């Protein structure tokens, strides 16, 4: 079939139902099938009708039901037998045409040991490429006719309501186009010489030369998202039952080397693997509005990560912690020599540290060494000029201020010997854990404020000087809490309400105005901008109240450093996992804004 | 576009590479792009070339690289601008054509309150159905040209090896066909009146009128297979760690109400949900060889179960047991009033019993009341004439003989009050658990032998009398073990070796010969039959040695009834879960045989 040719022999879902509309106008105004084949030595399914079950007072329109329908049996059967007969004529001349190929494909290495051979390939390539697809059209011809003859009977099983839909179907399925599979013995016959010596030795390269409608997505990754989602949830749920039934869940039990050894590590991993998830719940929202994240970030093609390849990292590696922090609760239910069981926390960190810098090819290299091309520029702060993916992962760390106290308690309990010596207070005695585990905790707001300084003494403009002010603002507002542990009075307490509400507007101003681009009164939209890259004007305003409700989580988690003081712990992992949820919609409206104020639409091939 | 018309403007992956083959013959015999638009007030991307980086000794073929390629920039750009201009001409006359529709679609309910309206629908249905698809062709025109211009440069980045694949791409993506999305603002413009008043009020019915390449499979079930696979494995693995660290795993601990209360539950549910899985690993092998299981079984259309809807039952309901038999280990680690914690085993059975007979619609009704149309005929054995799905689920129970002892120990510990009265030996004192928990254990081999009796006094033939002999054979061979507990001597021990090896050939004969159809010496294949419904003649013989190796698991599990005698327990759930693995390949070669000796090919629509 060079062109698709079954035109009168297509599905006749149009013509048959308006005759079923014509018995409908006879209502106000089921059959035993006489199976006979052709008396001409052929297989023409001429089906004689019989009315028995008292349809109407005079069945003048009941024969109109079969005045056309039994011809539709023949209409497929006259064609499919002849289209098979044409494909028998195109099924045996090819046996002779590839038989002279046998004379050629036998001597090409015999006589090489002793130039039309390449001309001989196109003589059989272009032949048997679409000659297969003439059969795949013929299977699609068969399936659509079953999709015809089954689905032309929906409303007849309501206005009459019988068991005819399998009864009629067994002169359809027993007719020649389905009671045989003689086109399907050709479905493996077409690849007898195509696979082994025509296209080479491959299996996918031989498939690609003749397959349109190629292949769907290999869904061995929708499963592996699910395998590790459920393995993490059930290992977590078998940690809030067993630790409940141990005594330790409320700390009404034995030694407190649980909530100071490995709560500072199921905290640091529940916050880091909530952010990587919300980075993958934002590629699902960037692609679904075509916000072109690869060109703005200057990514490239470069093995495009998707929202199934960061939904796979954040689940496969969070069940790997919820497992190793389940075999470590068991050993601390009975006791298994504390001097060596308390490296399992500090080694799971060490296992994850080397996967990130693993140089081989396994765990997403060319997007895991690009990420160390980003946190190399940010830590060397006043140098290393800012691009868009040098700004972005520097202001994803202003939600991981509570995470960066649980990667400084750990490397105090693993670097000065506090694990083998059995002491959970070795860090928090000296001045080291009064300022320098809370002053270097505001290191991410120093890296931002020294990237705007190079974005000022570079590019010149004034707007990268009020950006610089924004992080110095939330470095004084917690710098007053440094001088609030002493002189707790009416002195530096009308100052930690002063500078901490100066900050919380000066971050709230900058979010909508100079990051999200919103709050323009000189517009056609109330409190939004002119043009929107999204649907209905209702969820825009819901995200504007959630950057103010959720910035009470911020300024609680950066003035109430959890592992330095008061032992109310679960607030330090609930509110601190709300600021990580707050940024995650800030990532959306910062990229939508700097695409609707980038004005280009460079999408490399997506859809 | 009534016909697909981009023929010279198709991907030119043919013509450009043979010119790249022509610079290849110049080798033995990269550019800064001068971006200029049209000087005629248009957007014709005429790109002037420049050679700087010293390609060859004389660059006569380097200009041949750009003698055609920059024309391919124009060839898409002259067409896409004009095809958009045609779709502007087909983008503004439709604004006027649907504007007279506004005059019609406003008065149809005003004047109804006071017949060309239906003729007006086809005036805009058939217009805007494929006029959308003219744009979906134009997006496919754009994507294939990106799929052209990216994938015409594979071998040029090896013979020269530069960074040109994103450098060249930014005069491709910045050209008018991708630097705009003016066809994509029409992608939502086509459904402004189509969705709300043309097709009605639906979302899928409005989509079906104009969508070929409709939709792939909704993969919210490849995830839910995976969610419950991992939830079962991690709840199991958090049961072989916690019970290991309890004392009870080797029974070196407290009271033995573990391995007599709930090991006869996690035994009866690890065998029943291994068989339902291997019934779904056989629909994956029946469909993949087109063995037509629905017509042989006389199924019908009738909401066709797949191998994702029995891989979903057997995983979602095995994590629901591995959960409830994990909250029941915890309560029996500390003790929570034994008189009421020991109903959780006998209620999980009761929960699963009522799901099977649940009549509403939830858990696969019309295939769960058909299954009680099967185990109603089998238990009323000598009546109820045999069809193929009355035979099949009667001889799936001759692998669940060890399962049917753990559904008779349970309903002795739940029916005569042995749970509140605290006694794990109340059943196994009287004669009740010496014969009648082992003689009614061979009830499934009685239902088979009384279906062949109605298949004899019906249909007449001799072959349904040697079938009847086959189950009476393995009813005497274990009936000698009834008389082996006494007179253990050289008496009835040259009889339990006698009748039990008479059985194990008389099942081994019937499997290959009169069920699988194999072992015909009068054939062209050694020890197989003539025609095969499968691939290479190597895995046929591997399944013939696995019905003899694995029938030592049988006759061990039906002479060594596990909860009646000797306390070696894990052999009673390893070997008994091998006979359930043995049948599971018997289901394959029994249906392949009775399709290659059914000779019809009635496939209702699959592929
Ligand atoms: O295109 P039209 O000639 O206007 O026909 C329509 C259309 O039928 P086709 O798509 O088969 O041409 C509708 O079919 P659906 O696509 O909605 O299923 C169907 O609407 P109802 O089924 O809601 O009535 C109705 O066909 P029929 O009359 O066969 O029901 C029929 O309209 P008329 O035949 O009434 O013109
Ligand atoms: O169909 P032909 O005229 O015989 O051309 C083939 C074919 O090219 P097309 O499919 O583009 O027509 C091969 O392409 P692939 O499908 O294998 O990629 C390619 O084979 P190699 O790439 O292995 O050489 C080779 O094209 P080229 O010469 O451009 O490499 C070329 O054969 P000739 O051009 O050598 O006749």
PDB file of N, CA, C and O in Angstrom, chain A residues 143 146 170 173-174 178-179 181 184 216-217 219 222-223 225-227 230-231 234 238 245 326 330 333-334 601-605 607, chain B residues 143 146 150 170 173-174 178-179 181 216-217 219 222-223 225-227 230-231 234 238 245 326 330 333-334 601-605 607:
ATOM      1  N   UNK A 143      -8.234  -4.525  12.898  1.00  0.00           N
ATOM      2  CA  UNK A 143      -8.575  -4.028  14.228  1.00  0.00           C
ATOM      3  C   UNK A 143      -9.666  -2.970  14.182  1.00  0.00           C
ATOM      4  O   UNK A 143     -10.588  -3.005  15.006  1.00  0.00           O
ATOM      5  N   UNK A 146     -12.933  -4.678  13.585  1.00  0.00           N
ATOM      6  CA  UNK A 146     -13.432  -5.152  14.872  1.00  0.00           C
ATOM      7  C   UNK A 146     -13.864  -3.972  15.732  1.00  0.00           C
ATOM      8  O   UNK A 146     -14.907  -4.017  16.395  1.00  0.00           O
ATOM      9  N   UNK A 170     -19.644 -13.612  16.710  1.00  0.00           N
ATOM     10  CA  UNK A 170     -19.072 -14.896  16.328  1.00  0.00           C
ATOM     11  C   UNK A 170     -19.362 -15.296  14.885  1.00  0.00           C
ATOM     12  O   UNK A 170     -18.988 -16.404  14.491  1.00  0.00           O
ATOM     13  N   UNK A 173     -15.931 -12.671  14.144  1.00  0.00           N
ATOM     14  CA  UNK A 173     -14.621 -13.208  14.481  1.00  0.00           C
ATOM     15  C   UNK A 173     -14.342 -14.521  13.761  1.00  0.00           C
ATOM     16  O   UNK A 173     -13.176 -14.830  13.495  1.00  0.00           O
ATOM     17  N   UNK A 174     -15.382 -15.293  13.436  1.00  0.00           N
ATOM     18  CA  UNK A 174     -15.226 -16.504  12.640  1.00  0.00           C
ATOM     19  C   UNK A 174     -15.185 -16.236  11.146  1.00  0.00           C
ATOM     20  O   UNK A 174     -14.997 -17.178  10.370  1.00  0.00           O
ATOM     21  N   UNK A 178     -10.636 -12.636  10.681  1.00  0.00           N
ATOM     22  CA  UNK A 178     -10.138 -12.941  12.012  1.00  0.00           C
ATOM     23  C   UNK A 178     -10.016 -14.425  12.325  1.00  0.00           C
ATOM     24  O   UNK A 178      -9.232 -14.776  13.209  1.00  0.00           O
ATOM     25  N   UNK A 179     -10.748 -15.305  11.632  1.00  0.00           N
ATOM     26  CA  UNK A 179     -10.615 -16.732  11.908  1.00  0.00           C
ATOM     27  C   UNK A 179      -9.297 -17.249  11.335  1.00  0.00           C
ATOM     28  O   UNK A 179      -8.830 -18.334  11.697  1.00  0.00           O
ATOM     29  N   UNK A 181      -5.078 -15.974  10.657  1.00  0.00           N
ATOM     30  CA  UNK A 181      -3.995 -15.022  10.881  1.00  0.00           C
ATOM     31  C   UNK A 181      -2.938 -15.193   9.804  1.00  0.00           C
ATOM     32  O   UNK A 181      -1.738 -15.224  10.084  1.00  0.00           O
ATOM     33  N   UNK A 184      -0.469 -12.633   9.697  1.00  0.00           N
ATOM     34  CA  UNK A 184       0.420 -12.640  10.849  1.00  0.00           C
ATOM     35  C   UNK A 184       1.548 -13.652  10.730  1.00  0.00           C
ATOM     36  O   UNK A 184       2.558 -13.512  11.424  1.00  0.00           O
ATOM     37  N   UNK A 216       6.603   3.938  22.545  1.00  0.00           N
ATOM     38  CA  UNK A 216       6.261   4.870  23.607  1.00  0.00           C
ATOM     39  C   UNK A 216       7.417   4.982  24.595  1.00  0.00           C
ATOM     40  O   UNK A 216       8.529   4.508  24.352  1.00  0.00           O
ATOM     41  N   UNK A 217       7.152   5.616  25.731  1.00  0.00           N
ATOM     42  CA  UNK A 217       8.213   5.735  26.715  1.00  0.00           C
ATOM     43  C   UNK A 217       8.432   4.399  27.424  1.00  0.00           C
ATOM     44  O   UNK A 217       7.492   3.656  27.719  1.00  0.00           O
ATOM     45  N   UNK A 219       8.577   2.522  30.289  1.00  0.00           N
ATOM     46  CA  UNK A 219       8.061   2.772  31.631  1.00  0.00           C
ATOM     47  C   UNK A 219       8.637   1.800  32.651  1.00  0.00           C
ATOM     48  O   UNK A 219       7.933   1.207  33.467  1.00  0.00           O
ATOM     49  N   UNK A 222       8.664   4.744  35.611  1.00  0.00           N
ATOM     50  CA  UNK A 222       7.475   5.027  36.401  1.00  0.00           C
ATOM     51  C   UNK A 222       7.305   3.972  37.481  1.00  0.00           C
ATOM     52  O   UNK A 222       6.731   4.239  38.541  1.00  0.00           O
ATOM     53  N   UNK A 223       7.831   2.778  37.232  1.00  0.00           N
ATOM     54  CA  UNK A 223       7.837   1.725  38.234  1.00  0.00           C
ATOM     55  C   UNK A 223       8.883   1.994  39.306  1.00  0.00           C
ATOM     56  O   UNK A 223       8.605   1.839  40.498  1.00  0.00           O
ATOM     57  N   UNK A 225      10.246   4.860  40.213  1.00  0.00           N
ATOM     58  CA  UNK A 225       9.714   5.885  41.103  1.00  0.00           C
ATOM     59  C   UNK A 225       8.781   5.265  42.132  1.00  0.00           C
ATOM     60  O   UNK A 225       8.906   5.558  43.326  1.00  0.00           O
ATOM     61  N   UNK A 226       7.891   4.377  41.712  1.00  0.00           N
ATOM     62  CA  UNK A 226       6.943   3.773  42.614  1.00  0.00           C
ATOM     63  C   UNK A 226       7.540   2.749  43.551  1.00  0.00           C
ATOM     64  O   UNK A 226       7.083   2.638  44.690  1.00  0.00           O
ATOM     65  N   UNK A 227       8.536   1.990  43.083  1.00  0.00           N
ATOM     66  CA  UNK A 227       9.187   0.988  43.924  1.00  0.00           C
ATOM     67  C   UNK A 227       9.843   1.638  45.128  1.00  0.00           C
ATOM     68  O   UNK A 227       9.774   1.115  46.242  1.00  0.00           O
ATOM     69  N   UNK A 230       7.212   3.611  47.683  1.00  0.00           N
ATOM     70  CA  UNK A 230       6.600   2.747  48.672  1.00  0.00           C
ATOM     71  C   UNK A 230       7.592   2.124  49.626  1.00  0.00           C
ATOM     72  O   UNK A 230       7.241   1.799  50.760  1.00  0.00           O
ATOM     73  N   UNK A 231       8.836   1.942  49.189  1.00  0.00           N
ATOM     74  CA  UNK A 231       9.843   1.376  50.073  1.00  0.00           C
ATOM     75  C   UNK A 231      10.282   2.375  51.133  1.00  0.00           C
ATOM     76  O   UNK A 231      10.547   1.976  52.268  1.00  0.00           O
ATOM     77  N   UNK A 234       7.046   2.778  53.694  1.00  0.00           N
ATOM     78  CA  UNK A 234       6.890   1.649  54.600  1.00  0.00           C
ATOM     79  C   UNK A 234       8.068   1.463  55.543  1.00  0.00           C
ATOM     80  O   UNK A 234       7.890   0.911  56.632  1.00  0.00           O
ATOM     81  N   UNK A 238       7.533   1.914  59.396  1.00  0.00           N
ATOM     82  CA  UNK A 238       8.102   0.951  60.310  1.00  0.00           C
ATOM     83  C   UNK A 238       9.264   1.551  61.067  1.00  0.00           C
ATOM     84  O   UNK A 238      10.267   0.882  61.302  1.00  0.00           O
ATOM     85  N   UNK A 245       7.167   1.920  70.111  1.00  0.00           N
ATOM     86  CA  UNK A 245       7.202   0.770  71.013  1.00  0.00           C
ATOM     87  C   UNK A 245       8.643   0.438  71.409  1.00  0.00           C
ATOM     88  O   UNK A 245       9.134  -0.678  71.299  1.00  0.00           O
ATOM     89  N   UNK A 326      16.969   2.556  59.748  1.00  0.00           N
ATOM     90  CA  UNK A 326      16.110   1.579  60.399  1.00  0.00           C
ATOM     91  C   UNK A 326      16.888   0.393  60.941  1.00  0.00           C
ATOM     92  O   UNK A 326      16.539  -0.127  62.000  1.00  0.00           O
ATOM     93  N   UNK A 330      17.346  -0.592  65.373  1.00  0.00           N
ATOM     94  CA  UNK A 330      17.331  -1.955  65.890  1.00  0.00           C
ATOM     95  C   UNK A 330      18.546  -2.263  66.741  1.00  0.00           C
ATOM     96  O   UNK A 330      18.408  -2.808  67.838  1.00  0.00           O
ATOM     97  N   UNK A 333      18.147  -0.750  69.964  1.00  0.00           N
ATOM     98  CA  UNK A 333      17.091  -1.242  70.836  1.00  0.00           C
ATOM     99  C   UNK A 333      17.642  -2.225  71.861  1.00  0.00           C
ATOM    100  O   UNK A 333      17.187  -2.251  73.010  1.00  0.00           O
ATOM    101  N   UNK A 334      18.635  -3.019  71.463  1.00  0.00           N
ATOM    102  CA  UNK A 334      19.282  -3.993  72.331  1.00  0.00           C
ATOM    103  C   UNK A 334      20.689  -3.584  72.747  1.00  0.00           C
ATOM    104  O   UNK A 334      21.188  -4.067  73.766  1.00  0.00           O
ATOM    105  N   UNK A 601      11.971  32.668  22.990  1.00  0.00           N
ATOM    106  CA  UNK A 601      11.251  31.409  23.186  1.00  0.00           C
ATOM    107  C   UNK A 601      12.036  30.233  22.604  1.00  0.00           C
ATOM    108  O   UNK A 601      11.478  29.368  21.923  1.00  0.00           O
ATOM    109  N   UNK A 602      13.327  30.171  22.909  1.00  0.00           N
ATOM    110  CA  UNK A 602      14.256  29.189  22.350  1.00  0.00           C
ATOM    111  C   UNK A 602      13.994  27.819  22.960  1.00  0.00           C
ATOM    112  O   UNK A 602      14.731  27.381  23.846  1.00  0.00           O
ATOM    113  N   UNK A 603      12.985  27.103  22.483  1.00  0.00           N
ATOM    114  CA  UNK A 603      12.802  25.721  22.926  1.00  0.00           C
ATOM    115  C   UNK A 603      13.481  24.766  21.947  1.00  0.00           C
ATOM    116  O   UNK A 603      13.059  24.580  20.807  1.00  0.00           O
ATOM    117  N   UNK A 604      14.563  24.148  22.425  1.00  0.00           N
ATOM    118  CA  UNK A 604      15.080  22.948  21.778  1.00  0.00           C
ATOM    119  C   UNK A 604      14.052  21.849  21.995  1.00  0.00           C
ATOM    120  O   UNK A 604      13.281  21.924  22.958  1.00  0.00           O
ATOM    121  N   UNK A 605      14.079  20.814  21.151  1.00  0.00           N
ATOM    122  CA  UNK A 605      12.912  19.989  20.831  1.00  0.00           C
ATOM    123  C   UNK A 605      12.259  19.334  22.047  1.00  0.00           C
ATOM    124  O   UNK A 605      12.848  18.491  22.734  1.00  0.00           O
ATOM    125  N   UNK A 607       8.161  19.544  22.279  1.00  0.00           N
ATOM    126  CA  UNK A 607       6.842  19.192  21.755  1.00  0.00           C
ATOM    127  C   UNK A 607       6.478  20.068  20.563  1.00  0.00           C
ATOM    128  O   UNK A 607       6.211  21.262  20.713  1.00  0.00           O
TER     129      UNK A 607
ATOM    130  N   UNK B 143       9.141  20.661  14.928  1.00  0.00           N
ATOM    131  CA  UNK B 143       9.909  19.699  15.713  1.00  0.00           C
ATOM    132  C   UNK B 143      10.819  18.845  14.845  1.00  0.00           C
ATOM    133  O   UNK B 143      11.979  18.620  15.209  1.00  0.00           O
ATOM    134  N   UNK B 146      13.760  20.914  13.836  1.00  0.00           N
ATOM    135  CA  UNK B 146      14.733  20.866  14.923  1.00  0.00           C
ATOM    136  C   UNK B 146      15.358  19.481  15.004  1.00  0.00           C
ATOM    137  O   UNK B 146      16.572  19.339  15.194  1.00  0.00           O
ATOM    138  N   UNK B 150      19.380  19.541  14.402  1.00  0.00           N
ATOM    139  CA  UNK B 150      20.237  19.017  15.457  1.00  0.00           C
ATOM    140  C   UNK B 150      20.935  17.739  15.005  1.00  0.00           C
ATOM    141  O   UNK B 150      22.131  17.554  15.254  1.00  0.00           O
ATOM    142  N   UNK B 170      21.835  28.343  17.607  1.00  0.00           N
ATOM    143  CA  UNK B 170      21.267  29.619  18.018  1.00  0.00           C
ATOM    144  C   UNK B 170      21.035  30.592  16.866  1.00  0.00           C
ATOM    145  O   UNK B 170      20.631  31.728  17.123  1.00  0.00           O
ATOM    146  N   UNK B 173      17.376  28.216  16.444  1.00  0.00           N
ATOM    147  CA  UNK B 173      16.330  28.459  17.424  1.00  0.00           C
ATOM    148  C   UNK B 173      15.910  29.923  17.458  1.00  0.00           C
ATOM    149  O   UNK B 173      14.756  30.215  17.788  1.00  0.00           O
ATOM    150  N   UNK B 174      16.814  30.845  17.116  1.00  0.00           N
ATOM    151  CA  UNK B 174      16.472  32.257  16.998  1.00  0.00           C
ATOM    152  C   UNK B 174      15.863  32.614  15.654  1.00  0.00           C
ATOM    153  O   UNK B 174      15.477  33.770  15.457  1.00  0.00           O
ATOM    154  N   UNK B 178      11.192  29.145  15.477  1.00  0.00           N
ATOM    155  CA  UNK B 178      11.246  28.843  16.899  1.00  0.00           C
ATOM    156  C   UNK B 178      11.366  30.057  17.806  1.00  0.00           C
ATOM    157  O   UNK B 178      10.993  29.954  18.978  1.00  0.00           O
ATOM    158  N   UNK B 179      11.859  31.199  17.315  1.00  0.00           N
ATOM    159  CA  UNK B 179      11.951  32.376  18.173  1.00  0.00           C
ATOM    160  C   UNK B 179      10.559  32.969  18.390  1.00  0.00           C
ATOM    161  O   UNK B 179      10.346  33.772  19.304  1.00  0.00           O
ATOM    162  N   UNK B 181       6.300  31.733  18.857  1.00  0.00           N
ATOM    163  CA  UNK B 181       5.305  30.685  19.056  1.00  0.00           C
ATOM    164  C   UNK B 181       3.942  31.189  18.612  1.00  0.00           C
ATOM    165  O   UNK B 181       2.936  31.003  19.300  1.00  0.00           O
ATOM    166  N   UNK B 216      -1.715   7.817  25.025  1.00  0.00           N
ATOM    167  CA  UNK B 216      -1.080   6.566  25.410  1.00  0.00           C
ATOM    168  C   UNK B 216      -1.796   5.969  26.617  1.00  0.00           C
ATOM    169  O   UNK B 216      -2.877   6.406  27.014  1.00  0.00           O
ATOM    170  N   UNK B 217      -1.182   4.953  27.212  1.00  0.00           N
ATOM    171  CA  UNK B 217      -1.812   4.358  28.378  1.00  0.00           C
ATOM    172  C   UNK B 217      -1.646   5.269  29.593  1.00  0.00           C
ATOM    173  O   UNK B 217      -0.609   5.905  29.796  1.00  0.00           O
ATOM    174  N   UNK B 219      -0.576   5.807  32.805  1.00  0.00           N
ATOM    175  CA  UNK B 219       0.376   5.079  33.638  1.00  0.00           C
ATOM    176  C   UNK B 219       0.296   5.504  35.097  1.00  0.00           C
ATOM    177  O   UNK B 219       1.296   5.773  35.761  1.00  0.00           O
ATOM    178  N   UNK B 222       1.129   1.622  36.390  1.00  0.00           N
ATOM    179  CA  UNK B 222       2.499   1.144  36.499  1.00  0.00           C
ATOM    180  C   UNK B 222       3.137   1.681  37.767  1.00  0.00           C
ATOM    181  O   UNK B 222       4.040   1.058  38.335  1.00  0.00           O
ATOM    182  N   UNK B 223       2.655   2.826  38.236  1.00  0.00           N
ATOM    183  CA  UNK B 223       3.102   3.379  39.505  1.00  0.00           C
ATOM    184  C   UNK B 223       2.506   2.613  40.679  1.00  0.00           C
ATOM    185  O   UNK B 223       3.216   2.294  41.635  1.00  0.00           O
ATOM    186  N   UNK B 225       1.352  -0.477  40.776  1.00  0.00           N
ATOM    187  CA  UNK B 225       2.090  -1.727  40.909  1.00  0.00           C
ATOM    188  C   UNK B 225       3.383  -1.502  41.677  1.00  0.00           C
ATOM    189  O   UNK B 225       3.684  -2.262  42.605  1.00  0.00           O
ATOM    190  N   UNK B 226       4.123  -0.448  41.361  1.00  0.00           N
ATOM    191  CA  UNK B 226       5.382  -0.184  42.011  1.00  0.00           C
ATOM    192  C   UNK B 226       5.255   0.318  43.429  1.00  0.00           C
ATOM    193  O   UNK B 226       6.107  -0.003  44.259  1.00  0.00           O
ATOM    194  N   UNK B 227       4.219   1.116  43.713  1.00  0.00           N
ATOM    195  CA  UNK B 227       4.007   1.635  45.062  1.00  0.00           C
ATOM    196  C   UNK B 227       3.792   0.501  46.046  1.00  0.00           C
ATOM    197  O   UNK B 227       4.307   0.532  47.166  1.00  0.00           O
ATOM    198  N   UNK B 230       7.014  -2.112  46.418  1.00  0.00           N
ATOM    199  CA  UNK B 230       8.015  -1.674  47.370  1.00  0.00           C
ATOM    200  C   UNK B 230       7.497  -1.575  48.787  1.00  0.00           C
ATOM    201  O   UNK B 230       8.265  -1.710  49.739  1.00  0.00           O
ATOM    202  N   UNK B 231       6.198  -1.336  48.952  1.00  0.00           N
ATOM    203  CA  UNK B 231       5.635  -1.263  50.292  1.00  0.00           C
ATOM    204  C   UNK B 231       5.540  -2.637  50.934  1.00  0.00           C
ATOM    205  O   UNK B 231       5.745  -2.756  52.144  1.00  0.00           O
ATOM    206  N   UNK B 234       9.450  -3.772  51.725  1.00  0.00           N
ATOM    207  CA  UNK B 234      10.018  -3.098  52.883  1.00  0.00           C
ATOM    208  C   UNK B 234       9.289  -3.408  54.180  1.00  0.00           C
ATOM    209  O   UNK B 234       9.899  -3.331  55.250  1.00  0.00           O
ATOM    210  N   UNK B 238      11.169  -5.335  57.026  1.00  0.00           N
ATOM    211  CA  UNK B 238      11.055  -4.874  58.390  1.00  0.00           C
ATOM    212  C   UNK B 238      10.211  -5.824  59.208  1.00  0.00           C
ATOM    213  O   UNK B 238       9.420  -5.393  60.046  1.00  0.00           O
ATOM    214  N   UNK B 245      15.458  -9.646  65.856  1.00  0.00           N
ATOM    215  CA  UNK B 245      15.848  -8.967  67.089  1.00  0.00           C
ATOM    216  C   UNK B 245      14.686  -8.944  68.085  1.00  0.00           C
ATOM    217  O   UNK B 245      14.279  -7.924  68.626  1.00  0.00           O
ATOM    218  N   UNK B 326       2.508  -6.846  60.529  1.00  0.00           N
ATOM    219  CA  UNK B 326       3.622  -6.149  61.154  1.00  0.00           C
ATOM    220  C   UNK B 326       3.194  -5.351  62.376  1.00  0.00           C
ATOM    221  O   UNK B 326       3.949  -5.279  63.345  1.00  0.00           O
ATOM    222  N   UNK B 330       4.483  -6.288  66.652  1.00  0.00           N
ATOM    223  CA  UNK B 330       4.795  -5.254  67.632  1.00  0.00           C
ATOM    224  C   UNK B 330       4.008  -5.419  68.917  1.00  0.00           C
ATOM    225  O   UNK B 330       4.583  -5.355  70.004  1.00  0.00           O
ATOM    226  N   UNK B 333       5.444  -8.068  70.853  1.00  0.00           N
ATOM    227  CA  UNK B 333       6.783  -7.885  71.394  1.00  0.00           C
ATOM    228  C   UNK B 333       6.728  -7.451  72.854  1.00  0.00           C
ATOM    229  O   UNK B 333       7.576  -7.855  73.657  1.00  0.00           O
ATOM    230  N   UNK B 334       5.726  -6.650  73.207  1.00  0.00           N
ATOM    231  CA  UNK B 334       5.524  -6.167  74.566  1.00  0.00           C
ATOM    232  C   UNK B 334       4.341  -6.824  75.266  1.00  0.00           C
ATOM    233  O   UNK B 334       4.293  -6.840  76.499  1.00  0.00           O
ATOM    234  N   UNK B 601      -8.801 -18.971  15.720  1.00  0.00           N
ATOM    235  CA  UNK B 601      -7.960 -17.845  16.130  1.00  0.00           C
ATOM    236  C   UNK B 601      -8.809 -16.604  16.408  1.00  0.00           C
ATOM    237  O   UNK B 601      -8.474 -15.494  15.984  1.00  0.00           O
ATOM    238  N   UNK B 602      -9.888 -16.779  17.164  1.00  0.00           N
ATOM    239  CA  UNK B 602     -10.876 -15.735  17.436  1.00  0.00           C
ATOM    240  C   UNK B 602     -10.300 -14.714  18.405  1.00  0.00           C
ATOM    241  O   UNK B 602     -10.620 -14.734  19.595  1.00  0.00           O
ATOM    242  N   UNK B 603      -9.485 -13.784  17.925  1.00  0.00           N
ATOM    243  CA  UNK B 603      -9.043 -12.689  18.789  1.00  0.00           C
ATOM    244  C   UNK B 603      -9.957 -11.479  18.607  1.00  0.00           C
ATOM    245  O   UNK B 603      -9.971 -10.813  17.573  1.00  0.00           O
ATOM    246  N   UNK B 604     -10.733 -11.200  19.655  1.00  0.00           N
ATOM    247  CA  UNK B 604     -11.355  -9.889  19.791  1.00  0.00           C
ATOM    248  C   UNK B 604     -10.236  -8.890  20.041  1.00  0.00           C
ATOM    249  O   UNK B 604      -9.174  -9.285  20.532  1.00  0.00           O
ATOM    250  N   UNK B 605     -10.491  -7.608  19.764  1.00  0.00           N
ATOM    251  CA  UNK B 605      -9.462  -6.632  19.401  1.00  0.00           C
ATOM    252  C   UNK B 605      -8.358  -6.472  20.445  1.00  0.00           C
ATOM    253  O   UNK B 605      -8.583  -6.031  21.577  1.00  0.00           O
ATOM    254  N   UNK B 607      -4.492  -6.416  19.046  1.00  0.00           N
ATOM    255  CA  UNK B 607      -3.437  -5.774  18.265  1.00  0.00           C
ATOM    256  C   UNK B 607      -3.608  -6.059  16.778  1.00  0.00           C
ATOM    257  O   UNK B 607      -3.400  -7.185  16.322  1.00  0.00           O
TER     258      UNK B 607
END
